[PDB]
Design a protein around this ligand. Structure first.
Ligand SMILES: Nc1ncnc2c1ncn2[C@@H]1O[C@H](COP(=O)(O)OP(=O)(O)OP(O)(O)=S)[C@@H](O)[C@H]1O
Ligand SMILES: Nc1ncnc2c1ncn2[C@@H]1O[C@H](COP(=O)(O)OP(=O)(O)OP(O)(O)=S)[C@@H](O)[C@H]1O
Ligand SMILES: [Mg+2]
Ligand SMILES: [Mg+2]
Lengths: 630, 99, 272, 199, 51
């Protein structure tokens, strides 16, 4: 029996208590046979009543009575209370079994993520249907859990023993989650790796309006209507050459996904703009005087009468097809489209791979994307996912019988109040019409204030990490379904990792300490390390190469060796060698593989017989040879 | 809290249920002249189904427990079930038709 | 001992301690075996609770303090709070060893760039891995001493004892840094000097847009469509008449840093 | 060799003196140098010369004239890309300016750490408070009354915000611009004028 | 200004017209343009009356 104080005076709502207790901790109040559990955020100095302060102003031990829920008739805990406390009753601290019952449940719907702050043994049960049907968001400062938290949930939801048919997708602009999921996730990046695919977004699978927003900068003239007219003929023409099921010339649209060859578009459009005309006034191609981009030479010049004022985008477009940085979009590797518009495959594989892979997660790391059109592509990918599961909602693979969960990292730059991008115009729809198709959403942002209020209003529940600045705390508190004064006052002092969950996806708002994932399974970003890179001695640079690559728009030196074999062994994993070209290839953790050049193989033998790797590799190789890392 | 107060006032009677956030509990109070502490001081702890009636259509305001309708006649949206549809063993699909 | 007062309020994080304490100085709050460090926010009537002065209108001894972090079990200073303080606890001042503990760091990524206001013997360690990768910005008034605080930092970064391979570029518009780095930098400018090289920015190392933006003031009609034709022609011939690896008649674009003769451009284009 | 001088010299620091520039184009050049330094480092992130092995750091003086909220120049475009993608290729940046409120608010917020020297006018202080994250209520109401060189550092580059006192460079190593001294140039006795040469 | 029509193939409110055509072709709006019984023929007669 932990006796502290008892009530002695009443002031309407302020029920005054004389004493003989954590802030966000519940209190137990038994009344005859029914127990009352709840929060009293007014106690002591912050609760002494203004009426009585004249008598005893220099004392602070006083509580108040206002509850959250009542214990049923030995059945369970439900919000609200049948009766309110009265005079003489005493408050007792809650007990561990009470925590078990208040937070415990007999339903298999809930899943456990973290633990309650007081006692770690308790599980943190969180609904799943509401965590995927009512949408949600993650918020907090920059250095708090944030990404270390998002991975744990996706690493708990997507278990195969309990959810052997899960299906989700992750957007991670920094690409920092591929490290945690060693081999349990698909990961698509623009520039591949040893065992990763290409994030290819076939341009022919885009609505006409979005296409003109990435390749032409928003043409707003009569020329804009020339492109739409031109593309339609190509899309219409390919249908007649190759039969497709269910669409014909009549029901064809400018926006339906039928592959077309852009190379034919630019070449025919560009050539019909400037060329000598043998006979004046003739627009026929027979009066003028293709696998590679090489255009045939044209004689000096009258000028063609079939042209417009779209010279700048038309010549600017040609540049967008040259540089390798946009190779993902215009040169989709397996979806590369030949001149006649007939590719090898269709979106079947693209959809079958994005969401149909045998393994649950899919990851799109967008660090390799040029930041200029990052927003435009974010909206495009969202549209494809929503629409595909929209007209196929009765089939046995859609979202109705297998709901989806699109996760978006670093959203505050994309859902701005005044943001005019297409991402928000796409994210609004899923938050509105996604309920009855089961398309979820999880929002991440380190600075909620910039996020559009209407978007943050419609999310089901909110994850609340630590948040420092006062400007944002007030904004997030303004879109809370079920807020507590004793719990939300400690939001600016949450330790790393542990978050506060508020919304309709849980019975109660609770301060959970999410279990950190296993060591070695965490989201890590491999950015250059200055302290470990500036401290090493100088090395005579050979800038004659740096210039040459910068001219060629290449990223790999011409002195690389490809077909070397390796044998498994700081944490060196594999080591190669080749005496033919004096090339020593080494491999470290995180898949980092270098290629040191012109090294005697005596060291190669010495290292094998050195049996002292790590401490001995830096002895005579750290900064003693020219290496062209890969 | 987001609804226009211009149209709210003209409404005669209002049914009020559990209100947790303090931001909205104030706005509802502004549309009723009968500012009673007991009526609205107990607003944030109302059990599911409870309500408090204020207006001319009711002779006197107080809290009443609406009797739920019988099973088989109850509103429920047929939204897809996540845990039930993900728990079932994964089944090979064919996207040739979805496209 | 060192005693300040007692905590007479709690709101999760924001606290209002009453004395029996500088505006910026930290405050130390032991609880059993771990201690809570806090930041002062205001003093006097700004920290008094909303409902006290009615009976004591002139009782002004109140201070508002905030919570930043907490010290573990002899492990380290971890941000947040294990268990918030309650009414009627003890309070203590932040002494010299504590400042070392809170601000100390055994990691080698940190570098000393100054001294804290309270005690001069404390290095002002600021991460350099972060200062160079996330980003930085110096802001202040006009006579507040920015360029002097951009050299006292930019001169400790490129030390030759720890960072023999550092790398930095500077943009001074008034030429007020060349005097600071007498024998540590390669100063460039327009007017040659005895030991300062002359900044030279070849005009052919520029894109078509930028060159059109500094030379012709910006052309938009057929002139912009005539200059581009000529530049491409000039960069074609320099390839035929001299060998550059990799660049071919197709991979060559209008904006590859290949040399072309500007005088030939004006003379031939103008003479015609 | 040109690049070797700017970045590959035997001395670490480079210093570009622009005070002689014809200022009608001073903006475009700042957008020219950043582009060349960025492409050269970006396109050689494998070799041991790029930004992945010797991280760069670009410091820019008086940034409030080229990073205006509505400026139409080319420098702002460059200063945005390095503010966005630099973290991948290790190209940091430092910004110097005495008029924070004129800096674009979408660029000033993407700077991890901030040095907060004296600031008096309230159009800036109310704008710096609008971008710093771990904003204390006791160390940010102290901006206008700092001493010279008594900077305040807030951000993630430090564990928690600190009010430091930078150590000045040794005497004779300080930055000193060379402007004509009117009192010492107007007070000397007038000399016979030879204006034939001036023409 | 200039298949189901007999003719063989040969103000600035055009892009509304194409946007207008989107509603016509869409099956999803057939509840409104292609009412089960209330579609209007070229003669102008409707099979039933709004009464
Ligand atoms: N439960 C935890 N316990 C201890 N340390 C943690 C815990 N969670 C995270 N951390 C540590 O704090 C670091 C913060 O980095 P992150 O978790 O990636 O947060 P973040 O930087 O906001 O993520 P983004 O999406 O890249 S902004 C982590 O790398 C961990 O070292
Ligand atoms: N870190 C510093 N420590 C002490 N004094 C400094 C410091 N930096 C500048 N000063 C003082 O300010 C004077 C140097 O010239 P100032 O013009 O005041 O500084 P400044 O950096 O050139 O000004 P700006 O407009 O910020 S570039 C001297 O009186 C210095 O003592
Ligand atoms: Mg992260
Ligand atoms: Mg100055």
């Amino acid at each position: 029996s932990t006796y502290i104080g008892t009530v002695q005076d009443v002031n309407g709502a302020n029920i005054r208590v004389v004493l003989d207790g954590q802030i966000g901790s519940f209190v137990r109040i038994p009344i005859g046979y029914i127990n009352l559990f709840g929060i009293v955020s007014q106690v002591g100095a912050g609760a002494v009543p203004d009426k009585l302060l004249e008598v005893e102003p220099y004392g602070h031990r006083w509580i108040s009575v206002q509850l959250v829920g009542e214990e049923g008739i030995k059945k369970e805990f439900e919000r609200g209370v049948s009766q309110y406390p009265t005079i003489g009753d005493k408050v007792h601290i809650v007990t561990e079994p009470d925590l078990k019952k208040i937070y415990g449940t007999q339903n298999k719907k809930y899943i456990s993520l973290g633990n309650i702050a007081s006692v770690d043994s308790i599980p943190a049960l969180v609904n799943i249907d509401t965590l995927v049907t009512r949408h949600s968001a993650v918020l907090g400062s920059t250095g708090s859990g944030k990404s270390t938290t998002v991975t744990s949930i996706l690493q708990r939801i997507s278990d195969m023993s309990q959810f052997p048919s899960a299906r989700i997708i992750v957007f991670d602009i920094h690409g920092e989650y591929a490290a945690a999921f060693k081999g349990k996730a698909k990961v698509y990046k623009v520039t591949p790796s040893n065992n990763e695919l290409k994030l290819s977004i076939p341009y022919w699978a885009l609505t006409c309006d979005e296409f003109l927003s990435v390749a032409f900068g928003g043409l707003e003239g009569s020329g804009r209507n020339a492109l739409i007219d031109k593309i339609y003929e190509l899309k219409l023409q390919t249908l007649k050459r190759q039969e497709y099921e269910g669409i014909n010339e009549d029901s064809l649209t400018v926006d339906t996904p039928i592959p077309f060859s852009i190379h034919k578009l630019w070449f025919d459009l560009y050539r019909a703009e400037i060329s000598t005309h043998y006979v004046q006034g003739s627009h026929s191609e027979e009066n003028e005087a293709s696998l590679k981009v090489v255009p045939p030479i044209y004689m000096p010049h009258y000028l063609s009468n079939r042209g417009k004022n779209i010279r700048k985008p038309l010549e600017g477009l040609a540049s967008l097809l040259k540089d390798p940085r946009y190779e993902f979009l215009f040169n989709a590797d397996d979806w590369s489209v030949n001149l006649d518009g007939k590719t090898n495959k269709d979106l079947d594989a693209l959809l079958e791979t994005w969401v149909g892979s045998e393994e649950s997660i899919s990851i799109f790391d967008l660090s390799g994307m040029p930041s200029s059109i990052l927003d435009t592509l974010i909206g495009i990918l969202i549209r494809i996912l929503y629409d595909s599961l929209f007209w196929s909602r009765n089939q046995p693979e859609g979202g109705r019988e297998r709901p989806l969960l699109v996760v978006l990292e670093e959203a505050h730059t994309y859902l701005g109040k005044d943001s005019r991008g297409i991402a928000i115009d796409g994210v609004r729809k899923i938050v509105k019409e996604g309920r009855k198709y089961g398309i979820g959403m999880m929002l991440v942002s380190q600075r909620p204030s910039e996020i559009d209020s209407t978007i943050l209003s419609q999310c089901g529940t909110l994850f609340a990490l630590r948040m420092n600045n006062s400007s944002d705390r007030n904004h997030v508190l303004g879109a809370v379904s079920d807020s507590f004064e004793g719990l939300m006052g400690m939001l600016p002092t949450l330790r790393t990792g542990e978050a506060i969950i508020i919304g309709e996806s849980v019975r109660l708002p609770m301060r959970t300490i999410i279990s950190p994932p296993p060591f070695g399974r965490r989201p890590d970003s491999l950015d250059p390390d200055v302290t470990a890179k500036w401290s090493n001695n100088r090395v005579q640079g050979d800038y004659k190469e740096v210039l040459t690559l910068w001219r060629q728009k290449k990223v790999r030196s011409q002195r690389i060796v490809e077909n070397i074999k390796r044998l498994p062994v700081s944490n060196i994993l594999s080591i190669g060698y080749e005496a033919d070209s004096m090339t020593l290839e080494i491999e470290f953790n995180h898949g980092l593989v270098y290629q040191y050049y012109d090294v005697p193989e005596t060291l190669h033998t010495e290292l094998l017989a050195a049996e002292s790797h790590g401490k001995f590799f830096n002895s005579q190789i750290k900064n003693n040879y020219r290496f062209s890392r890969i």
